[PDB]
Amino acid sequence: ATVLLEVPFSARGDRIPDAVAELRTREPIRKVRTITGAEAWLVSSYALCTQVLEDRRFSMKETAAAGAPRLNALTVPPEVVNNMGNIADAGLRKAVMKAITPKAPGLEQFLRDTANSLLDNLITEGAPADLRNDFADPLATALHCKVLGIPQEDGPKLFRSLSIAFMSSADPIPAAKINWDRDIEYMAGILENPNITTGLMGELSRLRKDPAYSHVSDELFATIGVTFFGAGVISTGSFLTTALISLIQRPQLRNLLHEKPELIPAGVEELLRINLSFADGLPRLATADIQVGDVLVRKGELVLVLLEGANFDPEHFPNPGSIELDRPNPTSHLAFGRGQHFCPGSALGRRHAQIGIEALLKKMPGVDLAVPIDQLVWRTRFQRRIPERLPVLW
Ligand code: HEM
Ligand SMILES: Nc1ccc2nccc(-n3cncn3)c2c1
Ligand SMILES: Nc1ccc2nccc(-n3cncn3)c2c1
C-alpha cells in the first residue's frame, strides 16, 4: 500500500516536477492530502483551472469556515480571508485599486532609482551578492512603502513579519498572531499620523474622515494596509527572485533583453507564465455539487488550483517550458489568477519586475549564479517558493 498523494510536491522553485505533466495527462483533477491531513481535489489542466477560478460556487471566503477541510492553518483572522470583498462592500475598491497601479507620478522613477542604488551598493561591496536579500526583497519593500505612503525606514520591520505571516503550516502559528496584532497597531497609528498624506494610506486616511465612510470600521482601514503591504511585498519579491533565476539560467535571453530592453515586458510576461513562486494550489471550497472533468466535486470539499498545472499545459502553451516572446496568447496565463479574485496588483507587479530586470541587466550584464544551482536552499512550508539566498557574480 501507498499513501494518498501528498501536496505540495516540491518546494524547489527552479524546475517543475516531471510529475506535474504526468498528472495533468492521466488525471487533471485528482484527490490529494494536504499538510493538515485534509483531502482535496488538485486541478492541474488549464481548462479545469480556469473553470474552477471562473465559477464563484468555488468560494474563496468559504475556505475560512470553521470545520472545513484546510490546505493550511489561517494566519489572519477568518474575516480577512474575504479581504477584497470587505473592501468592495465598504465602497473602497475603486480607490484602493487606483492607489496600487504603477501610474502615480514619480513611482516608476522611484523604482528605477531604488533598483540602481541597491545594485551600485552590491557592485561597491564586490561579488558575490545575494539578489534576494539585498536586491529583490528590498526593492519590493521600498516599492510598497512608497505605494502605501509610509516611511521607508519602517519597511524592514514590516518585512521581517513575512517569513512567518506567509507560512503554510498544518497548525496555527503563535508568532503570526503576535506580528499581525503589532502590524495592525502600526497601521492604525499611520491612519492617525498627520505626516501620512500620500499613497494608499494617505488616501484611506482621508476617506476615513469623509461622511460617505463614517461607518467603515477602523479595523478594516488598518487591515487594508497590513494585507496589501504583506501580500504585495511577498508576491513581488518572491516573483522577481525566481524570475531572476530563470533569466540568469538563459544567457541568450539575458543577452537578448540586455541588447533590446524594449522586449523586457514580453520577457516578464513569459517569466510570469513559467513562474513557480506559488507553493500551493489556490484554495476554494465548493458551495454546491459541481462537475469538474470526470469528478463530481461535492459541497464542502476543498479544491486546489495548481497555477503551474495551467501555465505549463502544452494544450494551451505549446513548448510550455520554453520562454518565447512571440506567443499568440502571452497574457492568458494564470499567474495573477482569473475571475472574481484576479490580482488587483498585476500592473504594479509587472512594473516592479520589468524595472528591476532592466536595472540589473544594465548594471550587471555579466550576471551569473555564483554557486551551482542545486546549492540554493528552498524555503519549506511557506506560501511561496523562494531560495533563502540567491548568490550571484557578474
Ligand atoms: C508578481 C506579483 C504578484 C503575483 C504573482 C500575484 C498573484 C496573485 C494571484 C494568483 C491572486 C489570486 C488569488 C486567488 O484567486 O486565490 C492574487 C490576488 C490578490 N493580489 Fe496579487 N500578486 C502579485 C502582486 C500583488 C501586489 C503588488 C498586490 C498589492 C499591492 C497584490 C494584491 C492582491 C490582492 C489584494 C489579491 C486578492 C484579490 C481578491 O481576493 O479579489 N498582489 N495575486
Ligand atoms: N499573519 C499575517 C501577518 C501579516 C500579514 N500581512 C499581509 C498578509 C498576510 N497574510 C494573508 N494571508 C496570509 N498572510 C499576513 C498574515
Ligand atoms: N497577492 C496575493 C496573492 C494571493 C492572495 N490570496 C489570497 C488573498 C490575498 N490577498 C488579499 N488581500 C491581500 N492579499 C492574496 C494576495
Short mmCIF file of all heavy atoms in Angstrom, two decimals, residues 10 12 33 50 53-54 59 75 86 98 115 174 190 220-221 226 231 251 257 289 295 358 366 382 392, unseen atoms left out:
data_model
loop_
_atom_site.label_atom_id
_atom_site.label_comp_id
_atom_site.label_asym_id
_atom_site.label_seq_id
_atom_site.Cartn_x
_atom_site.Cartn_y
_atom_site.Cartn_z
N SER A 10 6.90 19.59 -4.32
CA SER A 10 8.32 20.03 -4.12
C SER A 10 8.35 21.50 -3.81
O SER A 10 7.63 22.30 -4.50
CB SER A 10 9.44 19.71 -5.18
OG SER A 10 10.75 20.27 -4.87
N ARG A 12 11.06 23.16 -4.43
CA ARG A 12 12.04 23.81 -5.36
C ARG A 12 11.36 24.60 -6.40
O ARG A 12 10.37 24.20 -7.07
CB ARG A 12 12.82 22.70 -6.15
CG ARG A 12 13.85 22.10 -5.42
CD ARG A 12 14.75 21.24 -6.33
NE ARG A 12 15.57 21.90 -7.34
CZ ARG A 12 16.74 21.31 -7.78
NH1 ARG A 12 17.13 20.13 -7.27
NH2 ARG A 12 17.52 21.84 -8.69
N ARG A 33 -3.80 14.71 -0.44
CA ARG A 33 -3.86 15.02 1.01
C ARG A 33 -2.99 16.27 1.25
O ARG A 33 -1.84 16.30 0.80
CB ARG A 33 -3.32 13.87 1.85
CG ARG A 33 -3.66 14.06 3.30
CD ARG A 33 -3.16 12.89 4.21
NE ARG A 33 -3.67 11.58 3.74
CZ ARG A 33 -4.91 11.22 3.92
NH1 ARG A 33 -5.85 11.95 4.42
NH2 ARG A 33 -5.30 9.94 3.49
N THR A 50 -9.15 27.06 -15.16
CA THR A 50 -9.98 28.19 -15.49
C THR A 50 -11.46 28.01 -15.13
O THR A 50 -12.05 28.92 -14.58
CB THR A 50 -9.81 28.64 -16.96
OG1 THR A 50 -10.14 27.54 -17.78
CG2 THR A 50 -8.38 29.18 -17.19
N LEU A 53 -11.69 28.65 -11.32
CA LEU A 53 -11.50 30.04 -10.92
C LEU A 53 -12.64 31.00 -11.42
O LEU A 53 -12.83 32.03 -10.82
CB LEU A 53 -10.18 30.60 -11.46
CG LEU A 53 -8.94 29.97 -10.73
CD1 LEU A 53 -7.70 30.50 -11.39
CD2 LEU A 53 -8.94 30.18 -9.24
N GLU A 54 -13.30 30.57 -12.53
CA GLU A 54 -14.40 31.44 -13.08
C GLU A 54 -15.70 31.06 -12.53
O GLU A 54 -16.75 31.68 -12.89
CB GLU A 54 -14.41 31.32 -14.61
CG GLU A 54 -13.17 31.98 -15.18
CD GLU A 54 -13.19 32.25 -16.55
OE1 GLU A 54 -13.76 31.48 -17.29
OE2 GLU A 54 -12.37 33.28 -16.76
N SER A 59 -15.72 28.84 -3.70
CA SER A 59 -15.59 30.10 -2.97
C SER A 59 -14.28 30.28 -2.29
O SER A 59 -13.80 29.34 -1.58
CB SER A 59 -16.71 30.10 -1.89
OG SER A 59 -16.56 31.14 -0.97
N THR A 75 -3.44 32.26 9.00
CA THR A 75 -2.50 33.14 9.68
C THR A 75 -3.08 34.54 9.87
O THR A 75 -2.37 35.41 10.39
CB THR A 75 -1.14 33.26 9.03
OG1 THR A 75 -1.32 33.83 7.76
CG2 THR A 75 -0.56 31.84 8.71
N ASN A 86 -14.57 42.57 1.51
CA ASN A 86 -14.84 43.51 2.52
C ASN A 86 -14.49 44.90 2.03
O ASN A 86 -15.28 45.89 2.27
CB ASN A 86 -14.01 43.20 3.78
CG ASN A 86 -14.37 41.90 4.42
OD1 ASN A 86 -15.48 41.42 4.36
ND2 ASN A 86 -13.35 41.28 5.10
N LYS A 98 -6.99 52.10 -7.50
CA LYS A 98 -6.31 53.25 -8.08
C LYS A 98 -4.95 53.54 -7.45
O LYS A 98 -3.93 53.96 -8.10
CB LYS A 98 -7.17 54.56 -8.12
CG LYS A 98 -6.44 55.84 -8.48
CD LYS A 98 -7.50 56.94 -8.80
CE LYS A 98 -6.90 58.06 -9.68
N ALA A 115 16.27 50.63 -7.43
CA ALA A 115 16.95 49.46 -8.06
C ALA A 115 18.39 49.80 -8.33
O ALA A 115 19.32 49.04 -7.99
CB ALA A 115 16.25 49.03 -9.31
N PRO A 174 1.65 30.78 16.64
CA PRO A 174 1.51 31.85 17.63
C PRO A 174 2.22 33.09 17.21
O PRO A 174 1.66 34.23 17.40
CB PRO A 174 2.08 31.22 18.89
CG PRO A 174 1.71 29.74 18.74
CD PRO A 174 1.97 29.49 17.25
N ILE A 190 -0.61 54.85 11.71
CA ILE A 190 -0.42 55.53 10.43
C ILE A 190 -1.67 56.26 10.07
O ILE A 190 -1.53 57.45 9.61
CB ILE A 190 -0.01 54.49 9.31
CG1 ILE A 190 1.46 54.03 9.52
CG2 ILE A 190 -0.24 55.01 7.93
CD1 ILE A 190 2.55 55.11 9.31
N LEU A 220 -11.00 47.69 9.48
CA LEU A 220 -10.82 47.41 8.01
C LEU A 220 -9.77 48.32 7.44
O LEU A 220 -8.90 47.90 6.68
CB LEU A 220 -12.11 47.56 7.26
CG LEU A 220 -11.99 47.30 5.75
CD1 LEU A 220 -11.49 45.89 5.44
CD2 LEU A 220 -13.32 47.48 5.10
N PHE A 221 -9.74 49.62 7.82
CA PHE A 221 -8.73 50.51 7.24
C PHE A 221 -7.32 50.03 7.58
O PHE A 221 -6.44 50.05 6.71
CB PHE A 221 -8.95 51.95 7.72
CG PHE A 221 -10.11 52.66 7.07
CD1 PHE A 221 -11.26 53.02 7.81
CD2 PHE A 221 -10.10 52.95 5.73
CE1 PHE A 221 -12.27 53.79 7.22
CE2 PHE A 221 -11.15 53.65 5.11
CZ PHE A 221 -12.23 54.03 5.86
N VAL A 226 -2.07 46.46 6.27
CA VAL A 226 -1.22 45.29 6.62
C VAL A 226 -1.28 44.27 5.48
O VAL A 226 -0.21 43.74 5.09
CB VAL A 226 -1.71 44.60 7.93
CG1 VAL A 226 -0.86 43.32 8.12
CG2 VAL A 226 -1.56 45.56 9.11
N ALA A 231 1.07 41.12 1.29
CA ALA A 231 0.85 40.31 0.09
C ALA A 231 1.58 40.87 -1.11
O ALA A 231 2.12 40.14 -1.94
CB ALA A 231 -0.63 40.15 -0.16
N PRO A 251 21.45 32.56 -20.60
CA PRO A 251 22.29 33.62 -21.01
C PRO A 251 21.91 34.36 -22.37
O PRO A 251 22.06 35.52 -22.48
CB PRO A 251 23.70 32.94 -21.12
CG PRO A 251 23.55 31.76 -20.24
CD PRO A 251 22.15 31.30 -20.20
N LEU A 257 17.58 40.48 -23.88
CA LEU A 257 16.94 41.58 -23.12
C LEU A 257 17.87 42.77 -22.80
O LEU A 257 17.42 43.92 -22.66
CB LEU A 257 16.27 41.12 -21.81
CG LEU A 257 15.25 40.00 -22.11
CD1 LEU A 257 14.59 39.64 -20.75
CD2 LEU A 257 14.11 40.42 -23.09
N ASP A 289 -22.69 20.88 -5.41
CA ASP A 289 -22.11 19.87 -6.15
C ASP A 289 -21.82 20.27 -7.54
O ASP A 289 -22.78 20.77 -8.21
CB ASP A 289 -23.03 18.60 -6.13
CG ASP A 289 -23.21 17.99 -4.80
OD1 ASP A 289 -22.60 18.30 -3.78
OD2 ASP A 289 -24.07 17.06 -4.79
N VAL A 295 -14.91 14.32 -12.32
CA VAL A 295 -15.22 14.28 -10.87
C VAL A 295 -16.41 15.11 -10.57
O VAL A 295 -16.43 16.31 -10.94
CB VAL A 295 -13.94 14.75 -10.04
CG1 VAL A 295 -14.26 14.89 -8.55
CG2 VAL A 295 -12.86 13.68 -10.25
N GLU A 358 15.37 45.46 -15.87
CA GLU A 358 16.09 46.46 -16.76
C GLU A 358 17.27 47.00 -15.99
O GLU A 358 18.36 47.12 -16.60
CB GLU A 358 15.04 47.55 -17.05
CG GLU A 358 15.57 48.54 -18.16
CD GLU A 358 14.57 49.68 -18.43
OE1 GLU A 358 13.31 49.54 -18.15
OE2 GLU A 358 15.10 50.78 -18.81
N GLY A 366 26.88 40.88 -17.08
CA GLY A 366 27.51 39.55 -16.96
C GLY A 366 26.90 38.75 -15.81
O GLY A 366 27.52 37.73 -15.47
N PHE A 382 5.96 27.11 3.20
CA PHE A 382 5.74 28.55 3.01
C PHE A 382 4.80 28.69 1.81
O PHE A 382 4.71 27.82 0.96
CB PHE A 382 7.09 29.23 2.78
CG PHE A 382 7.10 30.71 2.96
CD1 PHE A 382 6.92 31.29 4.23
CD2 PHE A 382 7.32 31.56 1.88
CE1 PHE A 382 6.90 32.67 4.37
CE2 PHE A 382 7.29 32.95 2.07
CZ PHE A 382 7.06 33.49 3.29
N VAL A 392 25.09 35.56 -6.58
CA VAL A 392 25.47 35.79 -7.98
C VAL A 392 26.82 36.50 -8.03
O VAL A 392 27.32 37.11 -7.06
CB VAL A 392 24.40 36.71 -8.70
CG1 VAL A 392 23.01 36.01 -8.61
CG2 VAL A 392 24.40 38.15 -8.19
#
